[PDB]
Design a protein around this ligand. Structure first.
Ligand SMILES: CCCCCCCCCCCCCCCCCC(=O)OC[C@H](COP(=O)([O-])OCC[N+](C)(C)C)OC(=O)CCCCCCCCCCCCCCCCC
Ligand SMILES: CCCCCCCCCCCCCCCCCC(=O)OC[C@H](COP(=O)(O)OCCN)OC(=O)CCCCCCCCCCCCCCCCC
Ligand SMILES: CCCCCCCCCCCCCCCCCC(=O)OC[C@H](COP(=O)(O)OCCN)OC(=O)CCCCCCCCCCCCCCCCC
Ligand SMILES: CCCCCCCCCCCCCCCCCC(=O)OC[C@H](COP(=O)(O)OCCN)OC(=O)CCCCCCCCCCCCCCCCC
Ligand SMILES: CCCCCCCCCCCCCCCCCC(=O)OC[C@H](COP(=O)(O)OCCN)OC(=O)CCCCCCCCCCCCCCCCC
Ligand SMILES: CCCCCCCCCCCCCCCCCC(=O)OC[C@H](COP(=O)(O)OCCN)OC(=O)CCCCCCCCCCCCCCCCC
Ligand SMILES: CCCCCCCCCCCCCCCCCC(=O)OC[C@H](COP(=O)(O)OCCN)OC(=O)CCCCCCCCCCCCCCCCC
Ligand SMILES: CCCCCCCCCCCCCCCCCC(=O)OC[C@H](COP(=O)(O)OCCN)OC(=O)CCCCCCCCCCCCCCCCC
Ligand SMILES: CCCCCCCCCCCCCCCCCC(=O)OC[C@H](COP(=O)(O)OCCN)OC(=O)CCCCCCCCCCCCCCCCC
Ligand SMILES: COC(=O)C1=C(C)NC(C)=C([N+](=O)[O-])[C@@H]1c1ccccc1C(F)(F)F
Ligand SMILES: [Ca+2]
Lengths: 48, 295, 819, 100, 49
């Protein structure tokens, strides 16, 4: 499970990190358009 | 009114029910403030709990009303209760409360939840000191009548003047050529333009002055009808962003005349009227003090 | 000891007011060992004066009740860092308490202790009327969470920090709308959150119209019922060539040299206007260089003023100060103007009064500057793009997306930018707090401070939402409280240079004179006079005026709007000729309101004629149909009274407004010289609409800064970095050289002066009319005597002196307060 | 033409007012002069756009003449009015529209 | 005479008279505009050029 927390908000992010860490996955944050490219290609480090 | 047939509850009405209702309203306020408004009809667990807490705050405030409506007359019996100044306000709060919380359980709208924000007012009925204070600031404006009646007509006169002069003038702007992308620079808010006139002409490279643009502030600041002219005049009167309106009228119709309209609106409307109001209030504070010092 | 103790406190003040960002290590040492010696010196102070003034007199007096708290905390804070006090934010507030210890000692002086017995009682007695104001803000915060809570779901990338998403944010937004700062931006977000500028969406303007009007009115009964009750009782307790042919012409030759100084060309160093004005230069120098001799060889502070003015104008036939030092030409007017001397002297002696409250606000603002440095020092840096957080990362280039579109981008070099109003040293903190006090751009600083992350790191959205309190307590003290007891100061002071009733009555009855009425003979037109002054006719014309107004408003953008104007023009000109058929044209113009209506009927006629001539083969003549509704004012006797009471007093104190006009003149000329070669680039604050090229543009800019528009952005728009105008005369490659740091002195000074004068100007006009405001309309007054005059003139139509004895019946047309 | 007409009508009342103690007649005439000026002003307006609807140009002799004439008439008529209209009362017993 | 033959009325009507003469002379005179697309300098008036 790779979980992405998109946007700039105040909602809690604990559970989403847990979902990512409890399921052999990873947790990414995408706050703007500039972060999209580098955060959407970075799961191929976990897959390898 | 009637005998002591039902009025076996007025016995407690004079107990320390001050604290029991003050704290209940205070907890209602705190439960109103921890609510978290979510968009597009989402929700979270907590909000769904603070509604299962509204029938607990809309019950206490209803039985503490059916405890006083049967302890004074048939309803009032002399126009006492509902004609008591504040006890009718509490009754209206408990009226809209149950009315709206029942109307919601019928079509199982949300705008009806907005009368729920009056419940903090029952604190001013709670203590007496705030009753006498809220009755002072309502008596200090009996003299401020003529000044408000002089401001209401200056806003109305300036709305009509601006409606005559600048109606439908801020509607063209510098678009990119053959495109619907308004052309600006880094910190420039989109201002009007003029092709073959006296207003400002487009200076961005590939840009043209063309019409069919709603207006400066997403279509809110303009003198296109009476409502919007009143809105923008009132906004300049409070001296907030009046220079933006001036600069936009400059950019549309020309540089030399329009300042008379605004420099005079800010001198008369803002400084003069504020002077009047300060004078009329201190002339009422010093008088009441010279009368209450004599006690 | 009374002065060694203050030497101690001054050393401690200077040790606290030198903590800046990136200080040298020796300064850190000098400070960390200079408080230790003063802590060990304040340890013995509560042991010696516990021995000289007895022991139990350390607690029965409030003054030194805390000097033990000073050290009790000092020692406590001295051993917390070295045990567990991590969180530099928490360590930063430990040094704040230190500031409190300095405050108790500084306060000693009679003037600085006599007022807390009044100021503290002002707050503590009236802390119940503060509760209603806090409850107003708490109701409107909740109402905003309802209306706009979670409705700012805009699909762009523009950041709208002032929203209503949760309770602290809604409280911040409502507070900002109360102070008035940028409330219109919040309104536009609210109107776009709903549909748009359509029918149901614009109705949420109301929330912002009642919150600003009814919320700024409780702030007149809160912070200004304090400085009319709890500052008046405080002072009440403390109570317990000599012709008109030459001098009146040489005065007139200052008003010409000054206007020649105004209309100059600062851009082109040598123009025809400058070449032409260079002759009036020598003329206006020479005359006053040959008019000092007549006034100093015939005779023996004010004329040396003139001689310096003419000396600087002669040595000008670096050297650039010669052209700024010449701008004090309008100040020799006070020399010959006798009417203006007496107002400038009141302005000079109005300052001995404000030195006790103006020095308590600067010390209060200096207390907050050091707290601000303790909190926000170094934290106001940022990167161009908010993804890099240290200066080592904020290098290179990055993409920006126009309109928020991921396929339309641009390369920008990213740079580690420091804010413009930061809090690094106490001078910068003091400048920032100054701009916050005038309410301008304070939410930008608030949100820059809520996001402050660490010492050399960039911002973290919504990090410390409690740092709002710092900005909201300051604003409550300085801008709302001290700025109100200072005005109350001025008011109750002017109350001294400003019984009664019997006096004014006997002067009224003695000086007053009865009225004219122009009652006619010749019944043919007596008939028409009987209807002209009937209540039916008067209460018909008001209806016609209201209907005219409603017709004038019904128009909109995209004919009937003209024929109806023809109709109303006709109806009013017929009433004018119908009244001339009654007042014989001699009693008609005797009444000013009738002259004023005659002035509008002609304007309307010309209006319609010009419209029809344009259509048959002047956009401002259309204001005559609009002014018709101003003559609704012959009936609103209360409102007309209220207008005359203040016009008579603006027409009585013009020499004070002359001060404001001279201030604008001097400052506009100085600024036209200093920063007048800056380029007019759009997207900045020195642009085509707001610049210093000509004289009207400079005066409009100054008037904009007086109102409190973004005067700090204009201040930053001219400070030695500014591309020079192309038409200017300057060395090549010397482009980025226009603008001066003198700007910081120019604006900060202007504002203060202009904020001062205006206040002055308000209270004069107020106190000048203090009879009308502080008046009972129930016991007596000049209104009763005016009504007596009315019933008199009813029986004696023309004045012609006084009337026959009996028709003594009038005591039935008399109100009981008179008979 | 309209401005000249106003000048003539204002001069009528201005002449016939210095005699017979018909002082009040200074109140109408004044405003006539005012309106005179105003009309000349809008002429300028017209002329302005004319010189733009047709190259270099220049206002030399009678445009300054008209500008000055309009300003003279305008300020002079308003000053005649404020010098004829009795007075801002300035005292609670003083009052406009009074006797002498 | 107080609002008629005081000085300020006479000086103000002298101002009016100068305005009148400048106005009656600034009408028929063709002395305020020129043009040359560019030696053909035209000259404007109120009726004919
Ligand atoms: C009830 C209590 C009383 C409260 C109200 C009391 C005050 C009354 C309000 C006064 C309004 C102020 C005058 C309006 C300003 C005109 C703006 C303007 O002209 O620009 C737009 C317009 C721009 O339109 P435009 O037509 O130029 O635009 C297109 C360009 N052309 C012309 C080529 C087609 O200006 C004009 O139309 C030209 C005429 C301007 C000349 C007006 C100046 C004199 C106006 C009256 C004088 C009074 C002074 C101010 C009031 C005095 C009171 C202290
Ligand atoms: C002097 C003033 C200085 C500045 C003080 C500003 C006003 C303080 C109000 C309380 C406060 O600051 O926090 C409100 C908080 C509710 O917010 P919270 O539950 O923290 O929301 C989650 C965060 N996203 O906690 C609350 O829920 C408080 C809600 C207020 C309702 C009580 C008011 C009743 C009437 C007056 C009594 C108070
Ligand atoms: C206190 C109680 C007074 C406040 C009562 C106002 C409650 C009205 C409810 C409106 C609302 O909450 O939103 C829904 C409604 C429908 O809109 P929607 O379909 O969501 O989309 C836009 C097109 N309608 O929205 C609308 O379409 C109408 C927009 C709102 C209409 C009212 C505008 C605000 C008025 C508030 C002024 C009251 C303040 C005075 C002080 C009250 C004392 C607390
Ligand atoms: C002590 C004082 C307290 C008193 C309380 C006063 C508070 C009230 C102040 C707020 C007034 C603001 C009014 C805002 C609404 C104005 C009307 C409006 O919004 O409509 C504009 C409308 C646009 O039309 P549009 O939509 O383009 O038409 C196409 C339709 N498919 O175009 C229109 O049709 C608008 C036409 C309306 C024009 C009316 C002009 C009013 C002038 C009246 C002057 C007298 C005032 C009343 C006298 C009172 C005496 C005491
Ligand atoms: C009631 C209680 C409170 C009272 C507060 C007291 C404050 C009083 C002070 C108010 C000051 C208001 C000043 C506003 C006038 C500014 C004039 C203006 O902004 O016009 C701009 C316009 C630009 O023209 P231009 O320079 O040609 O630029 C385009 C390229 N050429 O210019 C033009 O094109 C037309 C030029 C006409 C301007 C005539 C007047 C210019 C001089 C300003 C008048 C004020 C007196 C000067 C100094 C004292 C000002 C107070
Ligand atoms: C003076 C000594 C008091 C200094 C206290 C202080 O450091 O102020 C902190 C406060 C902002 O709160 P903050 O420090 O962010 O909260 C920590 C929770 N993480 O910001 C403040 O409240 C500073 C101002 C508090 C009182 C200063 C002057 C008070 C005078 C009358 C009130
Ligand atoms: C303590 C109380 C303080 C008093 C303030 C409260 C006053 C209440 C205001 C009444 C407003 C009622 C509006 C009536 C309904 C209008 C109907 C409407 O839909 O008009 C919208 C109008 C433009 O029409 P629109 O529909 O957008 O046209 C395009 C296609 N529809 O767009 C609009 O904006 C219409 C509404 C205009 C709002 C006018 C705002 C200025 C008037 C307030 C200034 C008065 C200041 C008084 C100062 C007193 C001093 C003490
Ligand atoms: C005076 C006391 C006023 C209280 C607060 C004053 C604000 C202090 C401003 C300051 O200290 O900033 C220093 C400023 C540079 O600050 P910074 O932002 O770091 O700029 C970096 C590049 N130079 O560099 C400067 O030059 C700032 C100098 C400010 C000039 C102060 C002059 C004040 C004149 C007003 C006196 C008359 C007003 C009083 C009248 C009575 C009525 C109130
Ligand atoms: C222009 C020609 C005439 C200008 C105004 C004529 C009307 C006028 O001035 O009325 C007199 C008015 C009050 O005077 P009165 O009603 O006699 O009461 C005095 C009691 N002590 O005195 C006033 O000043 C009333 C308010 C006048 C200002 C209104 C603006 C009128 C012109 C714009
Ligand atoms: C004059 O006005 C001005 O300028 C001001 C501003 C607004 N700002 C600031 C900050 C300040 N300071 O600081 O100072 C001031 C004040 C405020 C309040 C109160 C008082 C005061 C004084 F002045 F007295 F001191
Ligand atoms: Ca502002």
């Amino acid at each position: 499970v790779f979980t992405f927390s998109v946007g700039q908000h105040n909602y809690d992010r604990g559970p989403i990190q847990w979902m990512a860490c409890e399921n052999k996955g990873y947790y990414y944050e995408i706050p703007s358009i500039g972060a999209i490219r580098i955060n959407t290609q970075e799961y191929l480090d976990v897959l390898g | 009114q009637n005998p002591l047939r039902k009025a076996c509850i007025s016995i407690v009405e004079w107990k320390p029910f001050e604290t029991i209702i003050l704290l209940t309203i205070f907890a209602n306020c705190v439960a109103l403030a921890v609510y978290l408004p979510m968009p597009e009809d989402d929700n979270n667990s907590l909000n769904l709990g603070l509604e299962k807490l509204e029938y607990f705050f809309l019950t206490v405030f209803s039985i503490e009303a059916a405890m006083k409506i049967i302890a004074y007359g048939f309803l009032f019996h002399q126009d006492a209760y509902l004609r008591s100044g504040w006890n009718v306000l509490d009754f209206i709060i408990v009226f809209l409360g149950v009315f709206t919380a029942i109307l919601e359980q019928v079509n199982v709208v949300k705008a009806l939840r907005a009368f729920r924000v009056l419940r903090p007012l029952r604190l001013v009925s709670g203590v007496p000191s705030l009753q006498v204070v809220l009755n002072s600031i309502f008596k200090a404006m009996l003299p401020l009548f003529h000044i408000a009646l002089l401001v209401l007509f200056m806003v109305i006169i300036y709305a009509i003047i601006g409606l005559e002069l600048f109606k439908g003038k801020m509607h063209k702007t510098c678009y990119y050529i053959g495109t619907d992308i308004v052309a600006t620079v880094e910190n420039e808010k989109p201002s009007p333009c003029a092709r073959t006139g006296s207003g400002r002409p487009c200076t961005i490279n590939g840009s043209e002055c063309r019409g069919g643009w709603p207006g400066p502030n997403h279509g809110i600041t303009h003198f296109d009808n009476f409502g919007f002219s009143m809105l923008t005049v009132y906004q300049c009167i409070t001296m907030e962003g009046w220079t933006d309106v001036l600069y936009w009228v400059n950019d549309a119709i020309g540089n030399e005349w329009p300042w008379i309209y605004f420099v005079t609106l800010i001198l008369l409307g803002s400084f003069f009227i504020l002077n009047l109001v300060l004078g009329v209030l201190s002339g009422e504070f010093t008088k009441e003090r010279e009368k209450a010092k004599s006690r | 000891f009374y002065w060694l103790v203050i030497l101690i406190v001054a050393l401690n003040t200077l040790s606290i007011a030198s903590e800046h960002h990136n200080q040298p290590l020796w300064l850190t040492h000098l400070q960390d060992i200079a408080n230790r010696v003063l802590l060990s010196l304040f340890t013995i102070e509560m042991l010696l004066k516990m021995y000289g003034l007895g022991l139990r007199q350390y607690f029965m007096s409030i003054f030194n009740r805390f000097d033990c708290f000073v050290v009790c905390s000092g020692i406590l804070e001295l051993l917390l860092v070295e045990s567990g006090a991590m969180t530099p934010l928490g360590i930063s507030v430990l040094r704040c308490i230190r500031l409190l210890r300095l405050f108790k000692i500084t306060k000693y002086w009679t003037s600085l202790s006599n007022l807390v017995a009044s100021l503290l009682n002002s707050i503590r007695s009236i802390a119940s009327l503060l509760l209603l104001l806090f409850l107003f803000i708490i109701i409107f915060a909740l109402l905003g969470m309802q209306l706009f809570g979670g409705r700012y779901d805009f699909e762009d990338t523009e950041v709208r920090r002032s929203n209503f998403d949760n309770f602290p944010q809604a409280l911040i937004s409502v507070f900002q709308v109360l102070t008035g700062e940028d409330w219109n931006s919040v309104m536009y977000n609210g109107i776009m959150a709903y549909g748009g500028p359509s029918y149901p969406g614009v109705l949420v303007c109301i929330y912002f119209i009642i919150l600003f009007v009814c919320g700024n009115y409780i702030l007149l009964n809160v912070f200004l019922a304090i400085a009319v009750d709890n500052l008046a009782e405080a002072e009440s307790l403390t109570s317990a060539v000599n012709a008109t042919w030459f001098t009146n012409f040489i005065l007139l030759f200052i008003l010409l040299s000054s206007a020649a100084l105004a209309a100059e060309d600062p851009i082109r160093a040598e123009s025809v206007r400058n070449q032409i004005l260079g002759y009036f230069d020598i003329a206006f120098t020479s005359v006053f260089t040959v008019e000092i001799v007549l006034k100093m060889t015939t005779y023996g502070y004010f004329n040396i003023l003139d001689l310096l003015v003419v000396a600087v104008s002669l040595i000008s036939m670096v050297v650039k100060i010669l052209r700024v030092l010449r701008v004090l030409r309008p100040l020799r007017a006070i020399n010959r103007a006798k009417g203006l001397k007496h107002v400038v002297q009141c302005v000079f002696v109005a300052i001995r009064t404000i030195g006790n409250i103006v020095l308590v606000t600067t010390l209060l603002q200096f207390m907050f500057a050091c707290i601000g440095v303790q909190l926000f020092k170094g934290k106001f840096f940022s990167c161009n793009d908010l993804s890099k957080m240290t200066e080592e990362e904020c290098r290179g280039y990055y993409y920006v997306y126009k309109d928020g579109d991921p396929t339309q981008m641009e390369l920008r070099p990213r740079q580690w930018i420091h804010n413009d109003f930061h809090f690094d040293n106490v001078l910068s903190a003091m400048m920032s707090l100054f701009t916050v006090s005038t309410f301008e751009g304070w939410p930008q600083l608030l949100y820059r401070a809520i996001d402050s992350n660490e010492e050399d790191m960039g911002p973290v959205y919504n990090n410390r939402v409690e740092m709002a309190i710092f900005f909201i307590i300051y604003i409550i003290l300085i801008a709302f409280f001290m700025m109100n007891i200072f005005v109350g100061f001025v008011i109750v002071t002017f109350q001294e240079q400003g019984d009664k009733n019997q006096r004014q009555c006997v002067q009224y009855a003695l000086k007053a004179r009865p009225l004219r009425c122009y009652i006619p003979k010749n019944p043919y037109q007596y008939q028409v006079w009987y209807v002209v002054t009937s209540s039916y006719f008067e209460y018909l014309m008001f209806a016609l005026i209201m209907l005219n107004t409603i017709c004038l408003g019904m128009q909109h953008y995209h004919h009937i709007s003209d024929i109806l104007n023809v109709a109303f023009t006709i109806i009013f000109t017929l009433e004018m000729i119908l009244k001339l058929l009654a007042f014989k044209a001699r009693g008609y113009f005797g009444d000013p309101w009738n002259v004023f209506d005659f002035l509008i009927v002609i304007g309307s006629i010309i209006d319609v004629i010009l419209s029809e001539i344009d259509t048959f083969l002047s956009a401002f003549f259309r204001l005559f149909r609009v002014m018709r509704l101003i003559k609704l004012l012959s009936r609103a006797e209360g409102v007309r009274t209220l207008l005359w009471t203040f016009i008579k007093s603006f027409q009585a104190l013009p020499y004070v407004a002359l001060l404001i006009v001279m201030l604008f003149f001097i400052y506009a000329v100085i600024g036209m010289q200093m920063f007048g070669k800056i380029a007019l680039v759009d997207g900045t604050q020195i642009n085509r609409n707001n610049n210093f090229q000509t004289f009207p543009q400079a005066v409009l800019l100054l008037f904009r800064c007086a109102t409190g528009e973004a005067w700090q952005e204009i201040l930053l728009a001219c400070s030695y970095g500014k591309l020079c105008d192309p038409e200017s005369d300057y060395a090549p490659g010397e482009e980025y050289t226009c603008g001066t740091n003198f700007a910081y002195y120019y604006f900060i000074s202007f504002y203060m002066l202009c904020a001062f004068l205006i206040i002055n100007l308000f209270v004069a006009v107020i106190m000048d009319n203090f009879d009308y405001l502080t008046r009972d309309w129930s016991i007596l007054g000049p209104h009763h005597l005016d009504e007596f005059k009315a019933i008199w003139a009813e029986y004696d139509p023309e004045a012609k002196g006084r009337i026959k004895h009996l028709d003594v019946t009038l005591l039935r047309r008399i109100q009981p307060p008179l008979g | 033409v309209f401005s000249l007409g106003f000048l003539i009508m204002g001069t009528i009342c201005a002449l016939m007012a210095f005699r017979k103690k018909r002082d009040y007649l200074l109140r109408p005439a004044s405003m006539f002069y005012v309106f005179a000026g105003l009309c000349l002003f809008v002429s300028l307006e017209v002329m302005r756009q004319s010189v733009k609807r047709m190259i270099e140009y220049y206002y030399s002799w009678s445009f300054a003449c008209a500008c000055a004439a309009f300003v003279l008439l305008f300020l002079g008529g308003i000053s005649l009015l404020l010098f004829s209209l009795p007075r801002m009362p300035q005292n609670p017993w003083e009052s406009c529209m009074d006797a002498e | 005479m107080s609002p008629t033959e005081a000085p300020k009325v006479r000086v103000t009507l002298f101002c009016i008279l100068v305005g009148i003469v400048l106005a009656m002379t600034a009408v028929v005179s063709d002395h305020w505009a020129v043009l040359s697309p560019h030696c053909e300098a035209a000259h404007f008036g109120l009726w004919r050029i």
